[PDB]
Structure 1
């Protein structure tokens, strides 16, 4: 049994413009085993309508998934990605940074 903790990136499909429709992505990779919980948050609240890619894996056998949702960024709305996995003692929250 070898376990690996997920890497997390939170980012937009397109360069963010306030008031322009976009996609918010949460890309989870490098993890093992495959069971993982990923929520996208808006101002701390779970976003209910989120989709994800089909499970696949890398040359080291570690899994990757994209979680995504249609969104319209504004100056003040905060977005984040919340991830739980058997390797984490509590859920990890990564905030969306426009410039990352």
Structure 2
């Protein structure tokens, strides 16, 4: 049995177009632990992405917190794509300053 990852994209601090920040991609509730996580900026993959270390919670499920620096703007669109066995095709979820 497997378990479909719950993805969440959000900034560390309140987004303020122009001001720096951190964009987190929180993938959770998945299993097995093997998982691929890319963070995107306008469709292109962001290079130096911090990936937390394998962890799991009481319900035996793993979770990773990938993150990276970024400066929100009206123009730029950010997203996170997650590859994993419990899914046939990748999942991409886009950032949303209000969420």
Normalising by the smaller structure, the TM-score range is over 0.9
**1:3-30: CA deviation from partner (whole Å, max 9, x where unpaired):** 1110000000000001101000000000
TM-score, normalised to structure 1's length? 0.96
C-alpha distance in structure 1 between counterparts of 2:2 and 2:66, whole Å: 21
TM-score, normalised to structure 2's length? 0.97
**1:54-94: CA deviation from partner (whole Å, max 9, x where unpaired):** 11101110001100001111111000000010011111000
Cα-Cα RMSD = 0.6
Structure 1: any 5+ residue segments left out of the alignment?
Answer: none
Aligned 1:43-62 pairs, distance under 5 A = 43-62=42-61
Structure 2: any 5+ residue segments left out of the alignment?
Answer: none
C-alpha distance in structure 2 between counterparts of 1:37 and 1:54, whole Å: 13
Aligned 1:26-45 pairs, distance under 5 A = 26-45=25-44
Runs of 4+ in 1 over 4 A off after TM superposition: none
